[PDB]
């Protein structure tokens, strides 16, 4: 191991800047396809994420073809109606007015998976909680999300669809699970605050309400 310490004041600010300004993008994606060098930098970042027992359970299916995107867009439309039907009156009306994906607008989509059987018969760290491999994959997703923000690339997560239908479309095996569908594209404008707060779905919760000292429910 080597010497380490807090980043410089400027470096530190940049990190918090990416965390503080990245957004889930749906409708502002620009049309230019991302270059191979850019994609390589993003995947490289996701690959540097931590992983239970250093399992490195992720895979990335790069989707750029119009037909595939349209196919997946259709899978989303199918499931979203079912989703909306779960709400009523104002909310349902509101839910239907929201844009919850940019699958056809974003020139690139990445299906991020978790190979449930990678790592052998037993994987370190997953022995007592079977979901640790999926969690590891989400860590890869957040790293990508942040690096993309720094690159001027917007990212959007779309979790509204029947997984079995996406797996059939991409040919994903039974032993592999889809953790996230990400829509990517350059963006020149962003919402200063979560889009769902701006459109009155839910507001930012007070952080002081979520932190406890030594025991649950104790401030």
Ligand X SMILES: Cc1cc2c(cc1C)N(C[C@H](O)[C@H](O)[C@H](O)COP(=O)(O)O)c1[nH]c(=O)[nH]c(=O)c1N2
Burial profile 116-127: b = 16 or more Cβ within 10 angstroms, e = fewer? bebbeeebebbe
CA atoms of 99 and 182, how far apart (whole Å): 15
Q: 202 a known binding residue?
A: no
Task: End-to-end CA distance of the chain: give it in Å, rounded.
Answer: 38
Nearer to ligand X, 39 or 181 (CB): 181
Distances (CA, A) of 40 to 47, 60, 63, 81: 10, 11, 14, 35
Report the partner that residue 78 touches, choosing among ligand X, a second copy, none (CB closer than 5 to 8 A by kind). Answer: none
CA atoms of 133 and 43, how far apart (whole Å): 18
CA atoms of 7 and 114, how far apart (whole Å): 32
Q: 98 a known binding residue?
A: no
Largest CA distance in the chain: 59
Nearer to a second copy, 103 or 176 (CB): 176
Report the partner that residue 26 touches, choosing among a second copy, ligand X, none (CB closer than 5 to 8 A by kind). Answer: ligand X
Q: 219 a known binding residue?
A: no
Q: 23 a known binding residue?
A: yes
Q: 174 a known binding residue?
A: no
CA atoms of 207 and 104, how far apart (whole Å): 35
State in angstroms the smallest separation of the CB of 219 from ligand X: 26
Report the partner that residue 90 touches, choosing among ligand X, a second copy, none (CB closer than 5 to 8 A by kind). Answer: none
Report the partner that residue 82 touches, choosing among a second copy, ligand X, none (CB closer than 5 to 8 A by kind). Answer: a second copy
CA atoms of 15 and 143, how far apart (whole Å): 12
State in angstroms the smallest separation of the CB of 52 from a second copy: 6
Q: 24 a known binding residue?
A: yes
Report the partner that residue 101 touches, choosing among ligand X, a second copy, none (CB closer than 5 to 8 A by kind). Answer: ligand X
State in angstroms the smallest separation of the CB of 112 from ligand X: 11
Query: Which amino acids are annotated as binding site, given as ranges?
Result: 22-26, 51, 100, 159
As annotated, the binding site for FMN includes 22-26, 51, 100, 159
């Amino acid at each position: 191991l080597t010497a380490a310490g807090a980043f410089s004041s400027d470096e530190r600010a940049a990190v918090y800047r990416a965390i503080e300004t990245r957004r889930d993008v749906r409708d502002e994606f620009l049309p230019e396809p991302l270059s191979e060098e850019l994609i390589a930098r993003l995947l490289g970042a996701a690959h540097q994420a931590p992983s239970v027992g250093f399992m490195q359970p992720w895979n990335f299916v790069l989707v750029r073809q119009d037909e595939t995107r349209e196919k997946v867009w259709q899978a989303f439309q199918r499931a979203n109606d079912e989703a909306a039907e779960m709400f009523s009156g104002e909310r349902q009306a509101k839910y239907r007015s929201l844009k919850l994906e940019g699958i056809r607008k974003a020139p690139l989509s990445i299906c991020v998976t978790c190979d449930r059987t990678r790592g052998g018969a037993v994987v370190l760290g997953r022995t007592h909680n079977p979901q640790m491999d999926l969690y590891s994959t989400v860590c890869a997703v957040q790293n990508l999300w942040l690096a993309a923000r720094a690159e001027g690339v917007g990212v959007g997560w779309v979790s509204i669809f029947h997984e079995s239908e996406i797996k059939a479309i991409l040919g994903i095996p039974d032993h592999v699970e889809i953790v996230a569908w990400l829509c990517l594209g350059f963006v020149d404008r962003l919402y200063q605050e979560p889009e769902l707060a701006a459109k009155g779905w839910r507001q930012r919760l007070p952080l002081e309400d979520l932190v406890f000292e030594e025991g649950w429910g104790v401030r």
